[PDB]
Each structure stands twice: as C-alpha cells, then as structure tokens.
Short mmCIF file of C-alpha atoms in Angstrom, two decimals:
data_model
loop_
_atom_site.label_atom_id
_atom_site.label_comp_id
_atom_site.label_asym_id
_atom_site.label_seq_id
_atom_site.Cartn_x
_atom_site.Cartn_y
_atom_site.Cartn_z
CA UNK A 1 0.00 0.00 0.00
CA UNK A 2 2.89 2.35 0.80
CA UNK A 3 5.39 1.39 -2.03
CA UNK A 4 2.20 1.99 -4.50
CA UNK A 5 0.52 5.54 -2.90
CA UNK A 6 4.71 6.37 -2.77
CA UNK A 7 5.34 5.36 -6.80
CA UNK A 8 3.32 3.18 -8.26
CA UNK A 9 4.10 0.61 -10.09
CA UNK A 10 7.30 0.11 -12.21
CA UNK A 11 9.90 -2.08 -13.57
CA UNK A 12 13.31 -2.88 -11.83
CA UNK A 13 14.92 -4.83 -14.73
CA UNK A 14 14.32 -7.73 -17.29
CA UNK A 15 10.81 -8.84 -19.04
CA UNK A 16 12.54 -7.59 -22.88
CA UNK A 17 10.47 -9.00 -25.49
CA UNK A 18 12.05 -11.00 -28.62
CA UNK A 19 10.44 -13.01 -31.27
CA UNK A 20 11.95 -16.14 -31.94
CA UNK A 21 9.60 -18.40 -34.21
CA UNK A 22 9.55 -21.75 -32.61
CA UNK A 23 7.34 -24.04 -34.42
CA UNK A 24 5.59 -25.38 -31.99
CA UNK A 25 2.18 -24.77 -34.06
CA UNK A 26 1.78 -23.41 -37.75
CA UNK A 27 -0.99 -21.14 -36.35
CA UNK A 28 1.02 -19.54 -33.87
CA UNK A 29 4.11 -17.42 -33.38
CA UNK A 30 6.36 -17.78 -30.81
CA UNK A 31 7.84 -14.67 -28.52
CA UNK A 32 10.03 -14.86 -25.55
CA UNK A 33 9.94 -12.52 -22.23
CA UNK A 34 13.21 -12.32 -20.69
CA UNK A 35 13.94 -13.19 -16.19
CA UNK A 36 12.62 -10.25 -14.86
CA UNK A 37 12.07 -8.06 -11.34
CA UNK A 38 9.16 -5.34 -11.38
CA UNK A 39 6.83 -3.93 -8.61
CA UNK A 40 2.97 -3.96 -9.87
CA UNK A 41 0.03 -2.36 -7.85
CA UNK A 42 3.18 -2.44 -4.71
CA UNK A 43 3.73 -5.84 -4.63
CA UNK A 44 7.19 -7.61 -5.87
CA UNK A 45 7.28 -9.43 -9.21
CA UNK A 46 10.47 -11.57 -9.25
CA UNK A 47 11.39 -13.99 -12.28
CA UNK A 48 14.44 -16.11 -12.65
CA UNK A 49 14.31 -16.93 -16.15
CA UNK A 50 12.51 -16.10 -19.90
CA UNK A 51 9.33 -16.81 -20.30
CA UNK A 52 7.72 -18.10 -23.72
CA UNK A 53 4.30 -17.01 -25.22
CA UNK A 54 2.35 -17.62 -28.16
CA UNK A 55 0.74 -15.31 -30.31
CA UNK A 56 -2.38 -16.86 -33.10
CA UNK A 57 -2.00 -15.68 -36.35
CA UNK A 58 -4.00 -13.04 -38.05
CA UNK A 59 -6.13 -14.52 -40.51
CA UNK A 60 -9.09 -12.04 -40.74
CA UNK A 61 -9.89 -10.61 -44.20
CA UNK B 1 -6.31 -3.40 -39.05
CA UNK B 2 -4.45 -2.93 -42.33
CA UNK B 3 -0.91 -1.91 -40.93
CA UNK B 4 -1.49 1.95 -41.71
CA UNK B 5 -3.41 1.74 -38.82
CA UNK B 6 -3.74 -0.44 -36.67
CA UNK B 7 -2.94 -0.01 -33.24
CA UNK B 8 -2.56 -1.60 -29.18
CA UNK B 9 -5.65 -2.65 -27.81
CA UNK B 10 -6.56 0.29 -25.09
CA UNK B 11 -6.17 -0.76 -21.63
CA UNK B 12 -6.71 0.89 -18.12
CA UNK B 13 -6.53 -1.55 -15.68
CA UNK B 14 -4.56 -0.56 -12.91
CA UNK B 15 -3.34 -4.06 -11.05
CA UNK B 16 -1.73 -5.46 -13.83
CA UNK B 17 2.04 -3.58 -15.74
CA UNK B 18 2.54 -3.40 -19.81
CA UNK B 19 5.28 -5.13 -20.47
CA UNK B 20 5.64 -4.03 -24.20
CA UNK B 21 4.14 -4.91 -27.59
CA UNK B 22 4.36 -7.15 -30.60
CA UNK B 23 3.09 -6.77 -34.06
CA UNK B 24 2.07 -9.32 -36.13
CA UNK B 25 2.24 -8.60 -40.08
CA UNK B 26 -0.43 -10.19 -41.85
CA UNK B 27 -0.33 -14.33 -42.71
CA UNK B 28 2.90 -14.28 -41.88
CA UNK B 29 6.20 -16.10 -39.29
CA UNK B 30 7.57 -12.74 -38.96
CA UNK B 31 7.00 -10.69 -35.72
CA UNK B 32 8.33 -7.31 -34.75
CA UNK B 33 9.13 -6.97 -30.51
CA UNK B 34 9.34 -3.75 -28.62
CA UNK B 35 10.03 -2.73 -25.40
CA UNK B 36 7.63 0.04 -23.30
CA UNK B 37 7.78 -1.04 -19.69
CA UNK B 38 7.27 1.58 -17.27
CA UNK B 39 11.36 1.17 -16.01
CA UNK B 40 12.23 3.00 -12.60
CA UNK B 41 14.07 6.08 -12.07
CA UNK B 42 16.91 6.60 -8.86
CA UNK B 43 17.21 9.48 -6.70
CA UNK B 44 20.50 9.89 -9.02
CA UNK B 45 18.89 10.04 -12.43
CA UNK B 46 16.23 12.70 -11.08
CA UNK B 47 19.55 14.67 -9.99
CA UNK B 48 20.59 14.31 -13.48
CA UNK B 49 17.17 14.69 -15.68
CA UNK B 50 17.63 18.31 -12.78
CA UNK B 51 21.32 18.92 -14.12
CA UNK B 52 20.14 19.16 -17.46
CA UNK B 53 17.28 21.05 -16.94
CA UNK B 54 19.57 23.88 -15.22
CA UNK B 55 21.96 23.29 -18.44
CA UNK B 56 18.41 24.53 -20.90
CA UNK B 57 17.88 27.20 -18.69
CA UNK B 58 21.35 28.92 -18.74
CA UNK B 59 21.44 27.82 -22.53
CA UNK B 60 18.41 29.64 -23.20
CA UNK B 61 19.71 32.92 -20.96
CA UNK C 1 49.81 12.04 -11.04
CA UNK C 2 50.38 16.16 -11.85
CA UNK C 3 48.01 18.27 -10.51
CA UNK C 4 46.55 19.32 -14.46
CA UNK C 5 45.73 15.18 -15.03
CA UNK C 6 45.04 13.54 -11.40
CA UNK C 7 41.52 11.85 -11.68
CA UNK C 8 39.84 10.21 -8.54
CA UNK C 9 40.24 6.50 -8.70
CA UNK C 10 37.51 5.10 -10.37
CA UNK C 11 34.99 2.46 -8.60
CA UNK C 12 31.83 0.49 -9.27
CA UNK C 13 30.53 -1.54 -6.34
CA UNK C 14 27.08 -0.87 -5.56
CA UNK C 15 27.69 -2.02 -1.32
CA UNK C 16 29.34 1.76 -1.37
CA UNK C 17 27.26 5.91 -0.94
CA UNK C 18 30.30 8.27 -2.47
CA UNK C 19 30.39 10.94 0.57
CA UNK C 20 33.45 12.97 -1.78
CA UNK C 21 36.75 13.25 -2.47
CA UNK C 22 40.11 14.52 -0.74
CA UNK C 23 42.81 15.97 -3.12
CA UNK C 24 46.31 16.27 -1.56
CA UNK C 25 48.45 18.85 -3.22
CA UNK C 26 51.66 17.41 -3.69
CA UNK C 27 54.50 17.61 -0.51
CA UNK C 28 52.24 19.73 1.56
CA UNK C 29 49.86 19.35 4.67
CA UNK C 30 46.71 20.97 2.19
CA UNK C 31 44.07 19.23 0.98
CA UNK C 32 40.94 20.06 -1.43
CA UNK C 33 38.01 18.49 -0.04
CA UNK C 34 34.56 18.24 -1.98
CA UNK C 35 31.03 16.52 -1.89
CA UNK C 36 29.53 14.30 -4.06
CA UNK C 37 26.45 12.42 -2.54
CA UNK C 38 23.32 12.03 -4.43
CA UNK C 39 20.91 13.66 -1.99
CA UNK C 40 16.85 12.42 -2.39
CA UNK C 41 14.49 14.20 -3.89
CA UNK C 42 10.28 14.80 -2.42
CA UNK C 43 7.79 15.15 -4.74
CA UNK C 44 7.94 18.69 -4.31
CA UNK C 45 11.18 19.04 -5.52
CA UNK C 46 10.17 16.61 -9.08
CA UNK C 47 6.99 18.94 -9.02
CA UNK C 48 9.21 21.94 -9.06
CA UNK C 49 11.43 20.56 -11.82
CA UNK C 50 8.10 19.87 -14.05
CA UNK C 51 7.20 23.78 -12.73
CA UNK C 52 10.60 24.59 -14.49
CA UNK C 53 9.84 22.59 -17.56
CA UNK C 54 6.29 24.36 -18.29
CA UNK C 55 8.32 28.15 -17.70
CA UNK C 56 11.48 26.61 -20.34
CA UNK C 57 9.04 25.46 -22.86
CA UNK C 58 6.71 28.21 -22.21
CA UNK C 59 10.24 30.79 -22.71
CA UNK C 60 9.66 28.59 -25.81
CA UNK C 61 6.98 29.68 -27.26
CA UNK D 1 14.99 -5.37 -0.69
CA UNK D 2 12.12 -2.93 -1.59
CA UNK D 3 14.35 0.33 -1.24
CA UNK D 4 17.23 -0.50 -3.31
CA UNK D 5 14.63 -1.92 -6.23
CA UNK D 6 12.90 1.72 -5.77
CA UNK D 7 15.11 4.40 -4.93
CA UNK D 8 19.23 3.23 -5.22
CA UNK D 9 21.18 4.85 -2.24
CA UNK D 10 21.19 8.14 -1.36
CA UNK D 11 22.15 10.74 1.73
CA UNK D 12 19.18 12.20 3.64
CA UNK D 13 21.91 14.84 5.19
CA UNK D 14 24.95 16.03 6.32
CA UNK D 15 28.37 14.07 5.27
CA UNK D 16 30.38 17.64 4.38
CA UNK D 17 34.22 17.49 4.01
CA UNK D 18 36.96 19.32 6.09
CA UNK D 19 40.73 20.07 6.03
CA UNK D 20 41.80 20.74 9.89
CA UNK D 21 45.30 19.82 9.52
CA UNK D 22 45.35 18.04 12.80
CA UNK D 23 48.82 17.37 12.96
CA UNK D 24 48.67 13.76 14.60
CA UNK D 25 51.08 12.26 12.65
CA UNK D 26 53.73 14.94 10.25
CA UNK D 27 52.87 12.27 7.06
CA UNK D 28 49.24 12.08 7.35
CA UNK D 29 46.33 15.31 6.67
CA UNK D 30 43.26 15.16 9.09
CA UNK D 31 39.85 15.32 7.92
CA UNK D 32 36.50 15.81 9.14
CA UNK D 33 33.17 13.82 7.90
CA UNK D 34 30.50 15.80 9.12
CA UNK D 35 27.29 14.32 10.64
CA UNK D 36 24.83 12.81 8.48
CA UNK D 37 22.55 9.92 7.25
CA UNK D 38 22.20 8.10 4.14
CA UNK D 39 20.12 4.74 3.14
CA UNK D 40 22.56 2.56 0.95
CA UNK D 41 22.05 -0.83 -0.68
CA UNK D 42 18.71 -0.97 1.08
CA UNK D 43 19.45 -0.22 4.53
CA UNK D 44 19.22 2.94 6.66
CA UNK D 45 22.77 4.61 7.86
CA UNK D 46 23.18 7.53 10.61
CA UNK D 47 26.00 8.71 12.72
CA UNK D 48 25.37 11.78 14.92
CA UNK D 49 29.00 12.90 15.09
CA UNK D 50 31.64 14.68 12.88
CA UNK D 51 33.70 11.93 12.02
CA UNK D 52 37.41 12.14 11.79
CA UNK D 53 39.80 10.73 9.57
CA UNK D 54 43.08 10.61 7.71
CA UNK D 55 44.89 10.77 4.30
CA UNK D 56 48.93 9.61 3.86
CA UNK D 57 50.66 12.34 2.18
CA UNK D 58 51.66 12.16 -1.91
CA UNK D 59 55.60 11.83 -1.72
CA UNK D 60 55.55 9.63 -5.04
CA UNK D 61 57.81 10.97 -7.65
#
C-alpha cells in the first residue's frame, strides 16, 4: 500500500520481449519474455528466467 | 487493421504492468518486438534529468 | 599524477554511498576536499522541476 | 529489498568534508566527515558525530 501511494508501479529490470519463431504450431508465433524483477500495484514481481508465449496468427480478411 | 493503422488494444486496468508490444504482419512467421515497460528512475537520475534542466535554462539565458 | 591530469580513482561496487573526495596537493599538509552524494528528492522538488519545464518550454513559445 | 529496487542509495543529510590539519602524525592530513545519514544498498545509515579521519601524504615521484 505504501510502495504503491509512494510510486506506483514500475519495472526494476528484465521482461525484454524477442520473437523467436519456434514451431511449436503453424498457427502460432512464438515470442520470448526475458527473467525479470518489477513492482505492480506495490507488490514484488520476481522472475528467474525467460518466459515463452504464443501469439495466433492473423487470418481475418 | 491494415498496418497503416492499426494499433494496441486500449487498456486501463490498474493491477496489472505493460510489459511491451508485438506486431504481427499479416499471414505471416515474422513478428516485430518492442520494449515500453514503465522502467524506474533513482534518486541519481532525477539529480541528473535536474542537471540538465539547469543546463536549458542557462542555454536559453 | 600532476596536478593538471590527477583523476579520482575510479569504482563500481554498488555495497558503497560516495560521501566525496580529498585531493592532496603534492609535498604539503593541504588538501581540497569536496562533496559528491546524491541527496533524495520529495515530490515537491520533481513537481518543481516539471514547474521549471512548463516556464522553459513556455520561454519557448 | 524494496528500497534498493525503488530508490538506489542516497544521503538524507549532512556528510560535508573538512581540512583541519590536525597534525597527529607529520605524514598524514586530518579530515572531518560531518554528521549525516544516508540509506545505501537498502538499509538505513546515521551517525550523529563529525567523524574524523586521515589521508597519507603524496611523496611519489
């Protein structure tokens, strides 16, 4: 409550975002997230390592 | 959208952080990553951003 | 070093606040002794350096 | 944990520099920390008195 009335939230370091194209499925494309430390709403966010996501593909006309 | 314009889905929701944003070009592997995170600033880089603010003011007298 | 080239030595190690430096003058019992702590800033203070920003850009105009 | 990921370290007050000349030793200048307080790497720092110390001499050639 403090940290966020004080500044909000914010990012320390990390969470950089990088496409990398893994076919994992034809429909999707594949991004990574790097590790990561952020405060959100005041409370600590703390990641180790990247983290991979998926994006479908646009197909409307 | 056609890529002339489209844009970021609008979002106001105060608990969660932007990380960045990805675009996906249309039928297509490719995808183009960028970085917006709201990243911190020290006591030092306030005393800096204040630095050069007293360097535009005696550039401008 | 001579007095025209002598640099302070040069450090990164975040465990350490810089108080300032001491600057012997060379065979002599004087020294030149100055500051350099980053102080904090309130949110007065960042609101007067926004204050400062609307009179530059407004000298602007 | 929660200061250094918001605010890096910084002095609250004092920590001035001063060259007595205290002659305690005919190779070494006396100087005086003044009194002050700081938070560094996270954790909070004070010492209510002026705080003496000393600096060898430059006799390299």
């Amino acid at each position: 409550e403090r940290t966020y009335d004080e500044s909000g939230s914010y990012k320390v370091n990390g969470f950089e975002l990088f496409s990398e194209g893994n076919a994992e499925d034809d429909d999707h494309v594949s991004v990574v997230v790097d590790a990561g430390k952020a405060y959100v709403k005041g409370f600590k966010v703390d990641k180790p390592v990247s983290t991979r996501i998926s994006v479908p593909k646009s197909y409307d006309l | 959208n056609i890529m002339r314009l489209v844009t970021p889905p609008l979002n106001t929701d105060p608990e969660n952080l932007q990380l960045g944003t990805v675009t996906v070009l249309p039928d297509s592997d490719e995808a183009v990553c960028i970085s917006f995170a709201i990243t911190r600033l020290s006591m030092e880089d306030l005393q800096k951003v204040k630095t050069r603010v007293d360097n535009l003011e005696y550039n401008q007298a």
